[PDB]
Design a binder for these strands. Structure first.
Lengths: 149, 37, 127, 85, 98, 95, 50, 105, 76
RNA sequence: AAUAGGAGUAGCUUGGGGACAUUCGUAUUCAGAUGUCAGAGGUGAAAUUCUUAGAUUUUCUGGAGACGAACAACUGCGAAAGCAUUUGUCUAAAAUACUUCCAUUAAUCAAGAACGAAAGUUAAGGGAGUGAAGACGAUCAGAUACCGUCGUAAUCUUAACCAUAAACUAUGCCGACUAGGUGUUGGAUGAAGUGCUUCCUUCAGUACCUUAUGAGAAAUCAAAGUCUUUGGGUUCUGGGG
């Protein structure tokens, strides 16, 4: 675990086979269409995958299509510029900073706010290195509202 | 003494009192040097 | 028939007071301390002194008129200690022995729900 | 601003006058000249206009207050006490 | 429950409804009657509040008292300027009054 | 040696735990460390209990209790015979 | 402006008449106040703290 | 109270060990005891609010409020001795000799 | 080898060969005219596809389904 | 898709986590009464101290600051410092569940920064009780002390600061492998008791007892083990007094 003191191991088990279920014999186009509809509706890729498992009843996209959902969105050119993970982390950090602006005696909120921003810097640096954020890019707390707008 | 400033275990005056006595002495020397210069 | 009064017993290490009142507790009947009925007015007010005071109170209460008492116990100032003072058992035994009719008995010592600091430092009383 | 290392606004008084008093003056003077928030109109335009008197510029209203800032604790405690019953 | 409900509604009216800020536009909307609900701060002036309440009453339309100042109703809408009073003119997916 | 494995107290997973002050003498002692005795006692002696029953209004007797919970510091408890010095092995025995 | 007899205890008040009808003659300098500390049973007198 | 007496009422309750209890400890969860506490207060408030002061005084004697608390709170988590620790008056009408005499007689 | 032990197969998450604890169920409610794929250990709540009434309630640990329906287990 | 890591979703998950608002109880203390009548406080034993202008005691009111017992633990939470009334709000958190997403993002970290008990400093309140300083009575060979009684600074809150403590699980952190049993706290899985309760299996915490042909200078230690049969990774530290 990165910052917590736990080491909890609750996770996705995954079956041995990468083959399609018996139940669904659907064409790749049907699977792309279903994802496209969820994407168009404004759902984000984790939400789409969770929904695809639950609402549509389908085993996950990498097994039934042979290609990752983010990659499919990118191939159609429609993938989001800001990462889903980065978006939620920045949103939590903005929420903490708004709260901290009101309350100056919340030490734990201050401690978490520096911790989360440090985590944002590490994630940002990795995204810059993989060329998913610009070379000139840097995190700032001033512009963070604009980032997630 | 070393880092274990304390540990009164065989035959010596109290560490805390030595520390107080020396702090008081140190202040007096610091005044004397300040007076002189 | 019969009439009830209220016997307050306030027992502390220095003295054990027997103070009988109306059933309301508004109006007194007898104040007798314990130390007044100590012969030399010193020490702690022994079990014997506690007995003599309670006997005097019983004689006076019968002289006044009242035949029965409810007992209200109070131990050593509460916050200082919750211990019953030395004469308390003797005083209760004396009131029962005396011949007065014994109604309800309660501990009504003032009890801190909370807490606050008391005399002597954090090291406590050394003696 | 960045002109002074740590004296700030009492730099106007300069080297003259004892330093601890200049520090005491610094705290009062900082409080005195701040532009406070107006309860009535929602702008940070409330200034002290005379010793006990604080006027908001925007809504043009005079609140009687403390000497060096708008409120003491005492009045607030009294105000709450009156309200509660 | 209530503060969450009004903020969620305010976010939904921002997201998918239509709304309008400030005294004159709100007055125009109430007189027109195309509004459904006015949300007014207690830090809105007494007379201005009273007038808006009469206009609403006259047009048989809703007013909700906001627990929060003129600026706070603005910060909820992510605007630097104080709002003081606003009018919903098209509901979000959640109906603000219902 | 180091005598106490646990510090003489419920030290585990905790930093500060509040001091109480000794019933005997006001000595501060952590609630986790403190020597606690419940002391459910009646005020009555045996002869007194007989006299109170005989004196009593009603046959039914409520038997007035003392409920104390009296807390001792280590120094007091050993002096006043609430504890012993045990023995090196026996210092771990919870009976 | 209220008669002091009708004040709750622990109120903070100012501009007290030195005796009745004398127009706020006590407790009048900057930041000053008096406290009402008690009320008589008969209601004739009231007890204040300067 | 309906006849205009404002009171403060204090109700204790202990956990009960039900059908099986090999585990010696019989504490309840904080979420559960908060839920019990909330439920208890509403039952007390409801029983008090309806009636006049005289009827409430009659309800206290056989502990009817406690009986209703116990019945409801067994569903959340079994409890044991549920009593009223104290009642204090906040705001008591002290006048009306006629009503006092009528209640007395 | 470790394989003949039947007990370890159900002990937390990863085993000798990890395979999902979760499974799929064919669920039907009368008056909906459907029997429909559903996932034990779902997290998003599910309504019937032909009508507004509830299908499954998910909760912490597997799913709780509903008692208003009848459930076949759906298998490879 | 690493029994590495992050992110998500889900559950009327969890808890004295943090902050803000709110609110309750009680004692103590004071004031207003109240009924009494002589001593009461006080300790090794007294004296100092208080009391006929009514003390101490009783009961009622009102005020004020204060605190959160009992429950309550070889108990819970917190990065540590630290955290116990009620209800609400703003916040974070770990485990569980996952045929959900990312696709190596990591580990430990000089420099630098954050939070950091108690006391102290500086400013406002507040100054109940306790009470460094200080004052008396004793005590005693002397006592500037222990003890008794009084008592300013301080304790508390708000606003700054200060940056150390036996700031101790006296054991740097991450990582694997090692041994039983008794327990215990938070979840998930099954069954029998009367939907729920119990018990079984399993995870993440967490202690104890026994055992180490394991270790150690022994105390002891399930880590201080898998280390002359010496090398999983890394920061920091010590070199007789």
């Amino acid at each position: 675990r990165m910052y917590g003191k736990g080491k909890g191991i609750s996770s996705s088990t995954l079956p041995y086979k990468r083959k399609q279920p018996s139940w669904l014999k659907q064409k790749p186009s049907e699977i792309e269409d279903a994802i496209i509809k969820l994407a168009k509706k404004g759902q984000t890729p984790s939400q789409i995958g969770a929904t695809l498992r639950d609402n549509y009843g389908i085993p996950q996209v990498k097994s039934v299509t042979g290609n990752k959902i983010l990659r499919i969105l990118r191939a159609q050119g429609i993938a989001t510029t800001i990462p889903e993970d980065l978006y939620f982390l920045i949103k939590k950090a903005v929420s903490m900073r708004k709260h901290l602006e009101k309350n100056k005696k919340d030490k734990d909120c201050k401690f978490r706010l520096i911790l989360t921003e440090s985590k944002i810097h590490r994630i940002s640096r990795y995204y810059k290195r993989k060329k998913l954020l610009p070379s000139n890019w840097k995190y700032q707390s001033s512009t963070a509202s604009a980032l997630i707008a | 003494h070393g880092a274990s400033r304390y540990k009164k275990s065989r035959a010596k005056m109290r560490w805390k009192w030595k520390k107080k006595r020396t702090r008081r002495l140190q202040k007096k020397r610091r005044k004397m040097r300040q007076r002189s210069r | 028939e019969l009439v009830f009064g209220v016997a307050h017993i306030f027992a502390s290490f220095n003295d054990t007071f027997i103070h009988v009142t109306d059933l309301s507790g508004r109006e007194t009947l007898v104040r007798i301390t314990g130390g007044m009925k100590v012969k030399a007015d010193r020490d702690e007010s022994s079990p014997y002194a506690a007995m003599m005071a309670a006997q005097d109170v019983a004689a006076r209460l019968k002289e006044l008129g009242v035949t029965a008492i409810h007992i209200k116990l109070r131990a050593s100032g509460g916050t200082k200690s919750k211990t019953p003072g030395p004469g308390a058992q003797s005083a209760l035994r004396a009131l029962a022995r005396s011949g007065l009719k014994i109604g309800r008995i309660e501990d009504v010592t003032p009890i801190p729900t909370d807490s606050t600091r008391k005399k002597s430092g954090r090291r406590g009383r050394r003696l | 601003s960045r002109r002074t290392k740590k004296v700030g606004l009492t730099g106007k008084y300069g080297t003259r006058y004892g330093s601890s008093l200049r520090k005491q003056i610094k705290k009062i003077e900082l409080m005195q000249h701040a532009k406070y928030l107006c309860t009535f109109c929602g702008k940070t335009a409330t200034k002290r206009t005379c010793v006990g008197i604080w006027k908001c510029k925007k809504c043009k209203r005079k609140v009687c207050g403390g000497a060096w800032s708008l409120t003491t604790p005492a009045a607030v405690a009294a105000k709450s006490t009156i309200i509660r019953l | 429950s209530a503060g969450d409900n009004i903020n969620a509604k305010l976010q939904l009216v921002m997201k998918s409804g239509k709304y309008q800020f400030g005294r004159k536009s709100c007055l125009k909307a109430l007189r027109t009657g195309k509004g459904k609900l006015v949300i007014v701060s207690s830090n809105c002036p007494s007379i201005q509040r009273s007038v808006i309440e009469y206009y609403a009453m006259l047009s048989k339309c809703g007013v909700h008292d906001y627990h929060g100042d003129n600026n706070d109703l603005g910060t909820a809408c992510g605007k630097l300027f104080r709002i003081s009073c606003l009018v919903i003119t098209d509901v979000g997916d959640s109906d603000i009054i219902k | 040696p180091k005598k106490r494995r646990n510090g003489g107290r419920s030290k585990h997973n905790r930093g500060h735990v509040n001091p109480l002050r000794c019933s005997n003498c006001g000595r501060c002692v952590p609630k986790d460390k403190a020597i606690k005795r419940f002391n459910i006692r009646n005020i009555v002696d045996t002869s007194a209990q007989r006299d109170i029953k005989e004196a009593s209004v009603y046959s039914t007797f409520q038997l007035p209790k003392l409920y104390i919970k009296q807390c001792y510091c280590v120094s007091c408890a050993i002096h006043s015979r609430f504890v012993r010095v045990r023995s090196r092995e026996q210092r771990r025995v919870r009976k | 402006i209220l008669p002091i007899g009708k004040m709750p205890e622990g109120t903070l008040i100012c501009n007290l008449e030195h005796r009745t009808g004398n127009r706020g003659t006590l407790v009048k300098a900057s930041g000053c106040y008096a406290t009402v500390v008690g009320q008589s049973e008969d209601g004739k007198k009231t007890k204040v703290r300067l | 109270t309906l006849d205009n007496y404002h009171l403060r009422m204090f109700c204790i309750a202990f956990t009960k060990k039900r059908q099986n209890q090999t585990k010696s400890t019989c504490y309840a969860q904080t979420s559960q005891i908060k839920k019990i506490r909330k439920k208890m207060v509403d039952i007390m408030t409801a029983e008090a609010s309806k009636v006049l002061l005289k009827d409430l005084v009659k309800k206290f004697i056989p502990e009817s409020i406690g009986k209703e608390i116990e019945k409801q709170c067994k569903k959340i988590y079994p409890l044991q001795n549920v009593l009223i620790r104290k009642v204090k008056i906040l705001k008591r009408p002290k006048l009306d000799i006629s009503k006092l005499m009528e209640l007395h007689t | 080898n470790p394989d003949p032990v039947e007990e370890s197969k159900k002990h937390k998450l990863k085993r000798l060969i990890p395979t999902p604890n979760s499974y799929f169920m064919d669920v039907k409610c009368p008056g909906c005219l459907q029997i429909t794929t559903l996932f034990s250990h779902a997290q998003n709540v599910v309504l019937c596809g032909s009508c507004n009434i509830m299908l499954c309630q998910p909760t912490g640990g597997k799913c709780k389904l509903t008692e208003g329906c009848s459930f076949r287990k759906k298998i490879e």
